[PDB]
Amino acid sequence: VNSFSGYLKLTDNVYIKNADIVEEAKKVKPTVVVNAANVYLKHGGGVAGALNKATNNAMQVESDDYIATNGPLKVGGSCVLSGHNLAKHCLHVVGPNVNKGEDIQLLKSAYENFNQHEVLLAPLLSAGIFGADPIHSLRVCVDTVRTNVYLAVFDKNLYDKLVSSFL
Numbered sequence: 001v002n003s004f005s006g007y008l009k010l011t012d013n014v015y016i017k018n019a020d021i022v023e024e025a026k027k028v029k030p031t032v033v034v035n036a037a038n039v040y041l042k043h044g045g046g047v048a049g050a051l052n053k054a055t056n057n058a059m060q061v062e063s064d065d066y067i068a069t070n071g072p073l074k075v076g077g078s079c080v081l082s083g084h085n086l087a088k089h090c091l092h093v094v095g096p097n098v099n100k101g102e103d104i105q106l107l108k109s110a111y112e113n114f115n116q117h118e119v120l121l122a123p124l125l126s127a128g129i130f131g132a133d134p135i136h137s138l139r140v141c142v143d144t145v146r147t148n149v150y151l152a153v154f155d156k157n158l159y160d161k162l163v164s165s166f167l
């Protein structure tokens, strides 16, 4: 048993809910929250702008130190940093950004990072301002992630479409 409430079960291991991932993280304080990161960990907008704002910019301060030491992530890659006031840990995962010309095949590599963690609160990778088809992102998630993933979908209209079209 875990602390996640109100999710629809899609598969053995994948759950979904219409929720603000910021508000969900603040309520649950999961072990791992996933950020929709870019390779520079520049948390300007979307989930990383919203997650970073909720940390009062402490996520960005930590991230800048990480990049100064290690250099940029790979598209498809990840790093584990603090979860600040939102979670124990934040898994910063870089899905391909379609609006920058990145290979959508890298979305499966991105979701493979989730398998290193037994339970996660996550957004749909490469959705929203990263420009991918969210229906596709949910299919890749279901067919790639084997650990227990709790997906927060901000947009109620998209949530209903994801559920109603799910095979």
Ligand SMILES: O=C(O)Cc1cccc(O)c1
Binding pocket: 036, 046, 047, 123, 124, 125, 126, 127, 128, 129, 134, 152, 153, 154, 155, 156, 158, 159
């Ligand atoms: O949550 C959503 O409704 C779709 C979305 C919006 C912003 C970033 C995402 O990964 C996904």
